Amino acid sequence: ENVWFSHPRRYGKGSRQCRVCSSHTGLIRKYGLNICRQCFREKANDIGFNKFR
Amino acid sequence: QQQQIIKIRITLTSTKVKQLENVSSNIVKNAEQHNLVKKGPVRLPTKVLKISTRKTPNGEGSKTWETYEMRIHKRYIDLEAPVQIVKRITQITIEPGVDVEVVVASN
Amino acid sequence: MLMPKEDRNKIHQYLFQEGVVVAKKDFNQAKHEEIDTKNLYVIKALQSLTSKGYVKTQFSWQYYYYTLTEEGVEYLREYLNLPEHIVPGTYIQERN
Amino acid sequence: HKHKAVKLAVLSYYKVDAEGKVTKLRRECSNPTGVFLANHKDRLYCGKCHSVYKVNA
Amino acid sequence: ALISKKRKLVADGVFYAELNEFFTRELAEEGYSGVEVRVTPTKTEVIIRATRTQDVLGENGRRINELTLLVQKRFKYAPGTIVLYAERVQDRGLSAVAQAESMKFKLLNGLAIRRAAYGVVRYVMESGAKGCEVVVSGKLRAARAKAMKFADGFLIHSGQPVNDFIDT
Amino acid sequence: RPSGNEGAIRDKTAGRRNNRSKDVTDSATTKKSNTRRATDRHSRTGKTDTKKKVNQGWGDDKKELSAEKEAQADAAAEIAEDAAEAEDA
RNA sequence: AGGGCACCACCAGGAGUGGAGCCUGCGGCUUAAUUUGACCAACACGGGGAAACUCACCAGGUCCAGACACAAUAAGGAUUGACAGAUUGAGAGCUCUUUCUUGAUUUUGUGGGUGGUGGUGCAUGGCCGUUCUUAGUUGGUGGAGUGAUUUGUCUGCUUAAUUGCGAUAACGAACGAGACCUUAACCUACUAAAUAGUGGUGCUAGCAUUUGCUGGUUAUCCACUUCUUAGAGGGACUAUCGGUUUCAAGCCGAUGGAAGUUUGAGGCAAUAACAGGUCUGUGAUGCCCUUAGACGUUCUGGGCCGCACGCGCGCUACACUGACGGAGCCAGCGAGUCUAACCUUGGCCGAGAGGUCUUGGUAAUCUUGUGAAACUCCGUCGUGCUGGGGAUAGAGCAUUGUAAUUAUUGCUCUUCAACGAGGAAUUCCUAGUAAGCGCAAGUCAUCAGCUUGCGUUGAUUACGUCCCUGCCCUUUGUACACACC
Ligand SMILES: [Mg+2]
Ligand SMILES: [Mg+2]
Ligand SMILES: [Mg+2]
Ligand SMILES: [Mg+2]
Ligand SMILES: [Mg+2]
Ligand SMILES: [Mg+2]
Ligand SMILES: [Mg+2]
Ligand SMILES: [Mg+2]
Ligand SMILES: [Mg+2]
Ligand SMILES: [Mg+2]
Ligand SMILES: [Mg+2]
Ligand SMILES: [Mg+2]
Ligand SMILES: [Mg+2]
Ligand SMILES: [Mg+2]
Ligand SMILES: [Mg+2]
Ligand SMILES: [Mg+2]
Ligand SMILES: [Mg+2]
Ligand SMILES: [Mg+2]
Ligand SMILES: [Mg+2]
Ligand SMILES: [Mg+2]
Ligand SMILES: [Mg+2]
Ligand SMILES: [Mg+2]
Ligand SMILES: [Mg+2]
Ligand SMILES: [Mg+2]
Ligand SMILES: [Mg+2]
Ligand SMILES: [Mg+2]
Ligand SMILES: [Mg+2]
Ligand SMILES: [Mg+2]
Ligand SMILES: [Mg+2]
Ligand SMILES: [Mg+2]
Ligand SMILES: [Mg+2]
Ligand SMILES: [Mg+2]
Ligand SMILES: [Mg+2]
Ligand SMILES: [Mg+2]
Ligand SMILES: [Mg+2]
Ligand SMILES: [Mg+2]
Ligand SMILES: [Mg+2]
Ligand SMILES: [Mg+2]
Ligand SMILES: [Mg+2]
Numbered sequence A: 001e002n003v004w005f006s007h008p009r010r011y012g013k014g015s016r017q018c019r020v021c022s023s024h025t026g027l028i029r030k031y032g033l034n035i036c037r038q039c040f041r042e043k044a045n046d047i048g049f050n051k052f053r
Numbered sequence B: 001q002q003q004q005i006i007k008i009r010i011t012l013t014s015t016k017v018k019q020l021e022n023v024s025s026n027i028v029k030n031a032e033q034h035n036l037v038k039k040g041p042v043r044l045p046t047k048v049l050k051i052s053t054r055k056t057p058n059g060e061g062s063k064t065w066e067t068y069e070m071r072i073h074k075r076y077i078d079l080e081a082p083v084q085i086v087k088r089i090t091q092i093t094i095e096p097g098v099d100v101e102v103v104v105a106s107n
Numbered sequence C: 001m002l003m004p005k006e007d008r009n010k011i012h013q014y015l016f017q018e019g020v021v022v023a024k025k026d027f028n029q030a031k032h033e034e035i036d037t038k039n040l041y042v043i044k045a046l047q048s049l050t051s052k053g054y055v056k057t058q059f060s061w062q063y064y065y066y067t068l069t070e071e072g073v074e075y076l077r078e079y080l081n082l083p084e085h086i087v088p089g090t091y092i093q094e095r096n
Numbered sequence D: 001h002k003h004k005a006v007k008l009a010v011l012s013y014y015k016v017d018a019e020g021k022v023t024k025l026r027r028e029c030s031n032p033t034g035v036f037l038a039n040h041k042d043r044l045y046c047g048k049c050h051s052v053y054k055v056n057a
Numbered sequence E: 001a002l003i004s005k006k007r008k009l010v011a012d013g014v015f016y017a018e019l020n021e022f023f024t025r026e027l028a029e030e031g032y033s034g035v036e037v038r039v040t041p042t043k044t045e046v047i048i049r050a051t052r053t054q055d056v057l058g059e060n061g062r063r064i065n066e067l068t069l070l071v072q073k074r075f076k077y078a079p080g081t082i083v084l085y086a087e088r089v090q091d092r093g094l095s096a097v098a099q100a101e102s103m104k105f106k107l108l109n110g111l112a113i114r115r116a117a118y119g120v121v122r123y124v125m126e127s128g129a130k131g132c133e134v135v136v137s138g139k140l141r142a143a144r145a146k147a148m149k150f151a152d153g154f155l156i157h158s159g160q161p162v163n164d165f166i167d168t
Numbered sequence F: 001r002p003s004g005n006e007g008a009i010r011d012k013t014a015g016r017r018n019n020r021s022k023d024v025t026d027s028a029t030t031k032k033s034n035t036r037r038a039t040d041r042h043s044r045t046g047k048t049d050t051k052k053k054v055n056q057g058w059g060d061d062k063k064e065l066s067a068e069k070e071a072q073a074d075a076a077a078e079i080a081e082d083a084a085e086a087e088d089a
Numbered sequence G: 001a002g003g004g005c006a007c008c009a010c011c012a013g014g015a016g017u018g019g020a021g022c023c024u025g026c027g028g029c030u031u032a033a034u035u036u037g038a039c040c041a042a043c044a045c046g047g048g049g050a051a052a053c054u055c056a057c058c059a060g061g062u063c064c065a066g067a068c069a070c071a072a073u074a075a076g077g078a079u080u081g082a083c084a085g086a087u088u089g090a091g092a093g094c095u096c097u098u099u100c101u102u103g104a105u106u107u108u109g110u111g112g113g114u115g116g117u118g119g120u121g122c123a124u125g126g127c128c129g130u131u132c133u134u135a136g137u138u139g140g141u142g143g144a145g146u147g148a149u150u151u152g153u154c155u156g157c158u159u160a161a162u163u164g165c166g167a168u169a170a171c172g173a174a175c176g177a178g179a180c181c182u183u184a185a186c187c188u189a190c191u192a193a194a195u196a197g198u199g200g201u202g203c204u205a206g207c208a209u210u211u212g213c214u215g216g217u218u219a220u221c222c223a224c225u226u227c228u229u230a231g232a233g234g235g236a237c238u239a240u241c242g243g244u245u246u247c248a249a250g251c252c253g254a255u256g257g258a259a260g261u262u263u264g265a266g267g268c269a270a271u272a273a274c275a276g277g278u279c280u281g282u283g284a285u286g287c288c289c290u291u292a293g294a295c296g297u298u299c300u301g302g303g304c305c306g307c308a309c310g311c312g313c314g315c316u317a318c319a320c321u322g323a324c325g326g327a328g329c330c331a332g333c334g335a336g337u338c339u340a341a342c343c344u345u346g347g348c349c350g351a352g353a354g355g356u357c358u359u360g361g362u363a364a365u366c367u368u369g370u371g372a373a374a375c376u377c378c379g380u381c382g383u384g385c386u387g388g389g390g391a392u393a394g395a396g397c398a399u400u401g402u403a404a405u406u407a408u409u410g411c412u413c414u415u416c417a418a419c420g421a422g423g424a425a426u427u428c429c430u431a432g433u434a435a436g437c438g439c440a441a442g443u444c445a446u447c448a449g450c451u452u453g454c455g456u457u458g459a460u461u462a463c464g465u466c467c468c469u470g471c472c473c474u475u476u477g478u479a480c481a482c483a484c485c
Helices: A037-043 B017-033 B084-090 C007-016 C040-051 C071-082 E005-026 E063-075 E096-107 E112-126 E159-164 F004-010 F050-056 F064-083
Strands: B008-014 B048-055 B063-079 B100-103 C018-023 C054-056 C065-069 E032-040 E044-051 E082-088 E133-139 E144-153
Touching: A037 B017, B017 B063, B048 E005, B063 E005, B084 F064, B100 C065, B100 E005, C007 C018, C007 C065, C007 C071, C007 E044, C007 E144, C018 E063, C040 C054, C040 F004, C054 E005, C065 C071, C065 E063, E005 E032, E005 E063, E032 E096, E063 E082, E096 E112, E112 F064
Parallel strands: E044 E082
Antiparallel strands: B008 B063, B008 B100, B048 B063, C018 C065, C054 C065, E032 E044, E133 E144
């Protein structure tokens, strides 16, 4: 019920975090992954993104 | 309930073209032995979801880039069919891996 | 700090009634989904139970999974004063 | 830091005993939580009424 | 449900990855190896491939009711719209995940690595595998770290046969 | 006695053409010069670890027979405890 | 010492860069702070285009989100929150004034936790970069040697290749190369399609006319698949024929062919390493440091952009093979919103930026034929820093955003700098390639001079060598093996 503990977080880097590791930089937003690039390289195969060429 | 057509369209979306064309072959064979008039399985252009990343987790090294792809294949089969005997065999042997949507129409 | 008695009760009776609680690791969310209280109250009440036993916690992609132990059911039955050994809550209650 | 909480009884009320009836003034309010509020300097401490409070003492 | 196909299939992949790490963290002391999700009309079934089904299924349905309730509460399913089955990994020695977990639980029990890694290598190789490799990297009673390999048999390293015939 | 913008507009020794009088230090024409890597090989901790710690960490060469033989024994144990408990007992 | 290989080497050249102005990164300097890592393989790199957030830094202000255990203090109130005033950037009961509210949830201590973009990448894992995508690596049996080891794995020729042919105390194999997978190129052969088109016309409708250009209805049409799509296949194997070679492996030429540069381009990629980078991607992590006056967390403001200067990647130019004006007029890869405001057509208003009313699209359907730019034609200019160039700066109008000042960006008018082709040096590159040209995506509320891809226009020069540079092999020398640091 305290009115001083938050500031607007509706846009920009501070409004979005990685869904795995809560990071703000390097976030991949295309197709709504909302995963950082380092967690995406770990999780790409068990999402369905594969290296073909 | 006595041989009345519905004008349905079944859209089949998957990432695995073996399983997907197996399901579409089964649908085409079902219509081809129930004598249903059907437009054949129309194949949409396969969509490629490309994600380009740097390989490094820090920012050191030669700037090496990875292109990952997800490939999405889409078919649709139109039918004019009796729904109450189509759905007596539709709801069984449910396909895994392939997203199916059946939309009725009056066009 | 002051988590009031009504809010601790409605955390602990959801935990008994469903067996498990999932919380998003989102302090300042200030309303947990399916418990009628703040997300941080849910997190810290379940932390308080975890540290004295009574629930096992797991983290997994910013979402805080809590499950009751067997010491947990014998503590929450004493605490919330439910009928003695009639109620598992909820494993297993309704499917056998 | 906070209040030291002197060991109060029922207060701001005179007596039941003194010659020879009950002595409680300040007739009842629509406030159910009746009981006197705080009086600091020409104000009272509104706690139950969410919006409207028009009496000043 | 008014979502694109490009975003729906990606979100299905993210759901699979999140369940995979959730069961990897939960069911690690009873040898979970894999998970397979089948989305059907008004049911989605979650098959857990584990080396020990009895400690996935608990007793009288405990620890599978817990996982069904945990999964449906996190992913906001209505109850009875998602079900969890367990089945046992046949040919356990051909699973690289299960052997990595068995080596991990060997090394947390205080057992030497040239005993443990070779005892995984021979077990895989007489489980009916074409080749096996174990690499152990880190520090062991010395500050200066080294890595060491334990390979028997035949391995391919290049090409599409790696994606076909190699578990890692 | 103010300061700030009022003091900055009447601040002497300030401005581009007053820095332009003052010639550039020679620190401005250097580079980091190999970041202490001409002795990267030589471990500066000064340990040069003994043989006993390495041997009882990774196994020594004297006990390879005893390593391999009980590795064989426990691999056989895993083979038996798989093979006898599939559709038996 | 010898022999190889490679436009991250050279040759023959092209296009540059280095000079100019801006842009961005690094150093230095300055600063309250200008957070920091990195010095071929750092320097438009950390996806790092930071107004807040990000944020790690600086000046200040809260909160505990200090579990649990134990001991005190509580019910005669342990504790909690607050109107208004002082206070404060603050509409923070932060703290007081004051007196209300509260009710084993605390508070105060001691252990013990917890959090940390705090340290150590020289304690580590994982991932990545590099050696090196170079061609390298290994064992079985046999030979040699007391042995460590060695031969196989090689003089030559060949190949992109330890690729083969050959030679042969070795023979027969395995990893890597190749095969493979993905993509591009061909298929009037198959399967088809109102989410792709085409031809007719059941239908009609125009304009010039007497058939040319069109606009529209798929149980309020018929048919087809050439073009497009994507399934199944086919196809190239260097075929064939000459020449050359040890009549080998192969190489060159010609013809055929969609294709004869591994058919083009990638993905994957051995043995081992490096004190390579990353503890600041992670609820990856040992240890240490910190933990209520916090290095936790949050809020406000500032900073990361600060400017005598040195360096790197770039953008814009120095014009007539051009600028300007008008007119012509053509792509391909993407992306997109209700699991809430995304891509936006059309209509209207405005010089413009933009506003507004609607619409379509969860997408081969609609944005979108993304009518892109270079380009082409016709004009204006006319060798003058000029109508080249558009830095710097003034004033105004808009948009995004809680917030634009240290100009976010866009528009309009004005201002109109250097720069006349760039020493020394240095980069990339062998065909749909270089170069020119734009477009989409990424990050994104806004911001592209950046990157990732895409297509448009499309050359010159060589099809070589070991001279330079780097790497590899062999021989050789070694008092080195932590291996020349
Ligand atoms: Mg191979
Ligand atoms: Mg290969
Ligand atoms: Mg060579
Ligand atoms: Mg040259
Ligand atoms: Mg320059
Ligand atoms: Mg700085
Ligand atoms: Mg460092
Ligand atoms: Mg940059
Ligand atoms: Mg932060
Ligand atoms: Mg500092
Ligand atoms: Mg911090
Ligand atoms: Mg951390
Ligand atoms: Mg280290
Ligand atoms: Mg290192
Ligand atoms: Mg490392
Ligand atoms: Mg050998
Ligand atoms: Mg021998
Ligand atoms: Mg040899
Ligand atoms: Mg040799
Ligand atoms: Mg090669
Ligand atoms: Mg065709
Ligand atoms: Mg180092
Ligand atoms: Mg790391
Ligand atoms: Mg650490
Ligand atoms: Mg960083
Ligand atoms: Mg701040
Ligand atoms: Mg910067
Ligand atoms: Mg660069
Ligand atoms: Mg023109
Ligand atoms: Mg087009
Ligand atoms: Mg249009
Ligand atoms: Mg001029
Ligand atoms: Mg500003
Ligand atoms: Mg600024
Ligand atoms: Mg953009
Ligand atoms: Mg910006
Ligand atoms: Mg950038
Ligand atoms: Mg040379
Ligand atoms: Mg020596």
